[PDB]
Design a protein around this ligand. Structure first.
Ligand SMILES: CCCCCCCCCCCCCC(=O)O
Ligand SMILES: CCCCCCCCCCCCCC(=O)O
Lengths: 67, 261, 234, 276, 235, 68, 283, 233, 68
């Protein structure tokens, strides 16, 4: 039931490729029936700034005349 | 051609000769509540064209000394048309909006108006001795809306002036600097290039549907960003035209008749 | 009993401690999520939103609406229109912008910064403005001729009402501190007239522009910290 | 992992279509990057936006409240053995400001308690290890009227017991809420007065009731009064937010959103607009 | 031997704790189970059972058997026979019912609520009753006309005497509080005549009705709390 | 000899079982030979109210007159 | 599961009459001669299974060292509030043994562990009873607000990390990732934080030459959490620090003289590292 | 609720331990590495670097630059030019060389030690020197005959001016103490003239030579310890 | 998700080549989100002293005249 995930890169870890060695992984097990008891979940690095920076009905390209 | 926009719904259309590209807040259009999730179980009321049409609020003038204007969105149409009536008859409701602000001037008039749509627009109490103290009537001014002040003067619970909101313009009536208002969906009616601007408003809450007589999902804030000037104080008219979208209601009650001034 | 040994670190409470704990309310039925428009994933998504800069934070303008209005004359001037420190967290005018406010919660920052200007004067007003950025460690660009010796654009006033310049990430260090330090010197942002603004008869002679600041897509932060811009009585 | 954006190498541009020109009136932010503005070099960029994730931003346990309890030999102080606090996050400004960036949020809450004690009196003598009971009283549940009432049986109420010198106690609290997210703002009234009224029913506070926290010194009174303090800490985890707002710029007054007439001046002066 | 770290939360006593522990009486074999009828698996199974509503607890009719008897008559009236606040937890009469008692161990609840009425008149009695539910946030039902702007049933008295109305789950929220507050307005239930009760000569002229309340199958409760109806002297 | 099963859902879940992958699993091991020592059982959500709400000999139909 | 390499082994070697003899060289080239005993004298074969494990940089710098000692007082007198907490600059400068080891390299990159050893005693004859106290060690990154007193709002630590420890329990411990800005920490800085320009003070740089003006990692703020007692209790924290996952660059000479201060500056009374010998020919 | 037992050693702080510890700054992004020049992997890579021996730490030459200059003369002499005891971490002159300084952080050590000498004389001068190492436990060399009996090399003056000698690892024990010890000494190093330096006309009649010391490839240390050279008030 | 590595030799090992079977091993599991929380790294004895003792552009051999 244990999960294995990649650790955040430290001072003397591998290349920024983050795909080198088994020593960069960590193991974790949930010990509770209630998921609220789980340690913080993994970070979601997905982003979509256009939701707030370009919420335009009609899409525009950067070099297009704005008006 | 981005310049000319013909926007329509129901039995009404607004045509603008010069407008900036329209904004859809958060990239979403209002829709009806899908059957995958709902609080109420009554079959819904869907007024269609009776509510989904443009209504015009009483205009204001842009004097060179104005500090801004504000409206509570479902409040401003509460007594107007059939939309108003349906809001009073049903307990729950959901609606998005089309907010289209117009302000026409010739090329020689400078200045600009920022139009911001703020979900949960919450203003400070003018009374300093009380927290969040405001009457239903002062909190909900109607189609006329309210105005911003350049200065805050607590009445110390004197003649209900303390129930009225504190409304500093530079702090948006809340203690938050206006320069960051741009985080909210917004458009600028910069008179030199645009006569109008349109923003699509999805229904936003922690709930799928709520009671419109109790809760204002959104407010409208209009501020001079740049002073009006002409070469004399022209008082250029500002008109706010609003249309509900995908209006629905749920649960028929006695018509609600809120305390009246 | 399985033999064990408690190591240093036992029985301590760290505010950033990340471990499991028993549920206060076993089997609690959590209210289903619903879709709510406007989902935010990262603070940087807000850092990238244009914020109006309180540039005219001068005596009589500080804390009034007019602080956001940068004046422009039709009249001849060889003086800078404005001068601003780059550091978004340290500078007095920028520390209160959304970018600054977010960065005030961080110890270090990196990446280019976008400065966008909007002209709100008469439509019939014409002219050209010089916007430039000079990296730190040299005399400030107080003379237009030196202002040119750096990153710059010339803004044609017209229907394309706005323009922008991006202060490139030029730094000796990988990240700069959000602290008001001398080593991680910000650099200089200035604007000069390229030419005087000329207007037709019966047009105001006082024009304004609104400057905005936002993070670019290459931008990031390192470490979270308490901000200095809010306080509370004991 | 996903990463931040890189820079491509560029050269001179004589395009009739220019990325540096735009119109912010549309509501969109300017989109230009350094490669559009100046000639650039290629740069590989691994400076990943992890610290800025909402999950990391809200990952610290902030002090939220201070409770004050006394275990005393004086009969007039029995009542001071007992302290009930409303659950709230608005007591401390640093946490409140962070939470108020978002209009709505959903998260699981982790609570940790820190206990301390001292002698409030010059006189002292032997005091036994103190044990404390923290009982949660959900809204509408009966409250104890005093320190050793029958309600402390806590048959349904969640309750935790702690002794000094032991590890700080804690518990995880699944998202609890009437709505599908917590609201930090409420532009509305608890009740619509019908045909002036409602002055005391405005704002989030009028609809905010999650129950209260009751703390009691379990030890019976000793000849030497001991003064204790409970520092309550909170952090969100497994958190999502649905609407950015600017943070508060000036000092807060009360639980709701309001202002101090003497503290509405967040900015400082500079000599002139041309002074760096 | 094995390096470990004691995290916060260690050695604490939580009343909601679900950790394992040594058996004090290890290897005790449990007395074998037998089938016993009436097994209850969920408290909701009891919440769904019709229970009388103590509706006429007025002026000395309180805490007596007559307390559950709603009076009816053959006179002319446009007034309600009875009125209930919907809130099953805060209404003084609904709180003290089986549904209210189970419910009072919870802080939050949701779902539709069934109201069933039984007429205990003569066989020769006729008439029609108007029973309705008015969602919250508006002028209360008051008279018989405003009371029809909402969910209603017309109960035609007949051999299938008992009938029911369901106050549908209408709320802005997902769940409502059991606690009384101003926000969680339950709405109203009232009943008034469509027509007076009509009886022939030399038969009873007054009658009683028994109202019942029960949970609908979509009903649920959440967080547990101590119940305010239980009390004890200090120990 | 560990058991693995799902958790009651929390704030960041989509509320579908296994729709959250392995996120919602937990591991439990009994450490005692006496089942009295075990932690509480898996919630049993099965129920049947007819034992108490419709305990009748003649099957009732909802649309039929109850008193046929 | 591979066998680690050993130090150089010796091949059996006969004497030689070679005309190509490694004994002579030209050190002037900047290169050391490489003779091993088999190049100079007759040698036997020697199997070498000895290693250099203890000299790995990870092992060399693998011990925690006391880096600073902080002190605070829990008392109840009108002039004592200011003594309730201690604010300290993060540095390794305070203790010489660790500093000297680090100074073998010009640059280094590592993660750190912080361990805190707490103690207390009575500075006063009152010798009264006090309760076991909780202490708070809060980290305030540069530019973050600092507390004015021990009882203040900044101690809320909503963004800053902070650790709470009880006296009598295991020493608290935490890991800190490399937080340098550069790609390594610099142990030395031959430069200025800023460049005085033509329009400046002749002596400019006097307040900022050296590492002292660019190295800023914030402070630790330590307070007793407990409210004060009638009986004064004096306490202190011996802060221990250890490099971990450490690599270094550009080796340099170890310090030969008594350190003093933040820079490399020596004092006149301690510029004589060696003892005298009566003669060049003395064993 | 897994039953456990705390063994001795529980709840103690060992400065030399190796346990995991939670990060106080979770998910912190660490500045990416770059290829910084001059990477060092081991302290022994530095132990093998030749540094000067402050051999002439005698009155008038102590704690000065001249301390590293070994005098030579063209006159007849039967005396040793110099003498050192081979105790690299304890001798007054050797404990301060790079080899000695790295070694001052260790308790015990092994391997051979290399010495290199350089003539900084005129080009015009010629002659020969005897470098010699004598193992422990015997009268240290008092004259040239003793120097010839033990391990030695003849260093001619010539274009390849530098010459090295290696003091081979001869020891009873496997490792020697770094610390001065009556039991363990490393033997003796000396130098004598093999022949008089011949100096042509108008040529300096006095010279200097420099000496260097470094670890050989078979060198190692056993245990890290605090050094005696640095102190603090 | 454990790793098994050999141990450094102790007094009882008659194999100073680390070849006495499974007898000498240790097991390690990383328990934390960041690698900064991991225990010290595996020993790596690779060295190259020529970097500091013979950094000569021109290759020199030990018996070569240093200068020709
Ligand atoms: C013994 C401790 C149990 C405490 C139970 C607290 C329940 C969670 C209520 C959180 C209220 C604040 C929500 C918000 O507005 O962000
Ligand atoms: C809550 C306490 C957190 C402890 C923070 C300690 C930060 C240590 C790293 C900063 C110093 C880097 C330069 C150095 O190695 O000396």
């Amino acid at each position: 039931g244990a999960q294995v995930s990649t650790q955040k890169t430290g001072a003397h870890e591998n290349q920024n490729v983050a795909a080198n060695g088994s020593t960069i992984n960590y193991t974790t097990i949930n010990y509770y029936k209630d998921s609220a008891s789980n340690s913080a979940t993994r970070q979601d690095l997905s982003q979509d700034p256009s939701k707030f920076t370009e919420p335009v009905k009609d899409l525009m390209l950067k070099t297009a005349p704005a008006l | 051609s981005d310049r000319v926009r013909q926007i329509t719904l129901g039995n009404s259309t607004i045509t603008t000769q010069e407008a900036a590209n329209a904004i859809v807040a958060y990239g979403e259009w209002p829709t009806y509540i899908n059957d995958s999730e709902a609080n109420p179980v009554d079959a819904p009321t869907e007024p269609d064209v009776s509510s989904n049409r443009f209504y015009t609020l009483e205009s204001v003038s842009w004097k060179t000394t104005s500090r801004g204007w504000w409206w509570k969105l479902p409040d401003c149409l509460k007594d107007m048309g059939m939309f108003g009536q349906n809001m009073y008859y049903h307990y729950l409701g959901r609606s998005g909006y089309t907010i289209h602000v117009q302000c026409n001037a010739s090329k020689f008039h400078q200045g600009a108006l920022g139009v911001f749509l703020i979900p949960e627009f919450v203003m400070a109490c003018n009374t300093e001795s009380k927290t969040s103290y405001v009457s239903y009537i002062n909190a909900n001014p109607g189609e006329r809306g309210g105005e911003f002040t350049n200065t805050y003067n607590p009445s110390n619970t004197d003649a209900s002036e303390g129930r009225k909101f504190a409304a500093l313009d530079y702090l948006l009536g809340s203690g938050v600097l206006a320069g960051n208002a741009f985080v909210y969906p917004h458009q600028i009616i910069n008179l030199r290039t645009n006569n109008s601007a349109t923003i699509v408003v999805p229904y936003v809450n922690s709930l799928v549907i709520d009671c419109m007589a109790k809760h204002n999902n959104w407010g409208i804030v209009i501020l001079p960003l740049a002073p009006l000037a002409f070469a004399s104080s022209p008082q250029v008219p500002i008109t706010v035209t609003i249309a509900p979208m995908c209006t629905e209601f749920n649960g028929l009650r006695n018509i609600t008749v809120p305390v009246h001034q | 009993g399985l033999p064990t040994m408690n190591t240093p670190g036992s029985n301590q409470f760290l505010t950033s401690d990340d471990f499991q704990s028993p549920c206060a309310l076993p089997n609690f039925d959590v209210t289903p999520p619903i879709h709510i428009p406007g989902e935010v994933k990262n603070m940087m998504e807000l850092a990238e939103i244009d914020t109006l800069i309180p540039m005219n934070a001068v005596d009589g303008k500080v804390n009034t609406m007019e602080m956001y209005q940068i004046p422009l004359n039709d009249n001849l001037s060889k003086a800078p229109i404005f001068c601003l420190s780059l550091s978004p967290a340290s500078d007095k005018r920028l520390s209160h912008t959304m970018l600054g406010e977010i960065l005030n919660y961080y110890t270090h920052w990196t990446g280019s910064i976008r400065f966008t200007f909007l002209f709100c004067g008469s439509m019939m007003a014409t002219g050209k403005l010089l916007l430039s950025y000079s990296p730190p460690g040299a005399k400030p660009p107080t003379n237009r001729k030196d202002a040119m010796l750096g990153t710059h654009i010339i803004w044609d006033l017209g229907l394309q009402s706005s323009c922008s310049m991006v202060a490139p990430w030029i730094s000796n260090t990988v990240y700069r501190r959000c602290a008001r330090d001398d080593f991680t010197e910000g650099g200089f942002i200035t604007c000069f007239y390229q030419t005087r603004i000329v207007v037709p008869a019966s047009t105001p002679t006082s024009m304004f522009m609104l400057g905005f600041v936002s993070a670019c897509p290459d931008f990031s932060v390192r470490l979270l910290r308490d901000t200095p811009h809010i306080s509370q009585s004991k | 992992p996903p990463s931040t954006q890189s820079t491509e190498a560029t050269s001179g541009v004589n395009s009739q279509e220019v990325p540096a020109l735009t119109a912010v009136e549309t509501g969109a932010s300017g989109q230009a990057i350094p490669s559009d503005v100046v000639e650039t070099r290629h740069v590989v960029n691994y400076k990943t936006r992890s610290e800025s994730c909402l999950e990391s931003f809200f990952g610290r346990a902030a002090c939220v409240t201070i409770l004050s309890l006394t275990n005393s030999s004086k009969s007039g102080e029995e009542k001071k053995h007992f302290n009930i606090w409303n659950i709230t996050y608005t007591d401390t400004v640093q946490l409140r400001r962070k939470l108020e960036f978002f209009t709505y949020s959903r998260f699981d809450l982790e609570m940790t308690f820190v206990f301390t004690e001292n002698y409030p009196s010059t006189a002292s003598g032997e005091v036994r290890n103190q044990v404390y009971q923290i009982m949660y009283i959900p809204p509408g549940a009966p409250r104890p009227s005093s320190w050793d009432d029958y309600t402390w049986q806590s048959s349904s109420n969640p309750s935790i017991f702690y002794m000094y010198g032991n590890a700080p106690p804690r518990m995880s609290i699944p998202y609890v809420g009437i709505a599908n997210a917590y609201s930090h703002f409420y532009d509305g009234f608890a009740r619509v007065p019908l045909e002036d009224a409602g002055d005391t029913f405005y704002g989030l506070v009028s609809i905010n009731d999650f129950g209260v926290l009751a703390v009691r010194a379990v030890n019976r009174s000793n000849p030497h009064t001991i003064h204790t303090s409970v520092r309550v800490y909170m952090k969100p985890k497994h958190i999502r937010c649905w609407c950015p707002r600017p943070p508060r710029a000036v000092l807060y007054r009360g639980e709701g959103v309001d202002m101090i007439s003497s503290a509405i001046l967040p900015l400082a002066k500079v000599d002139s607009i041309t002074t760096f």
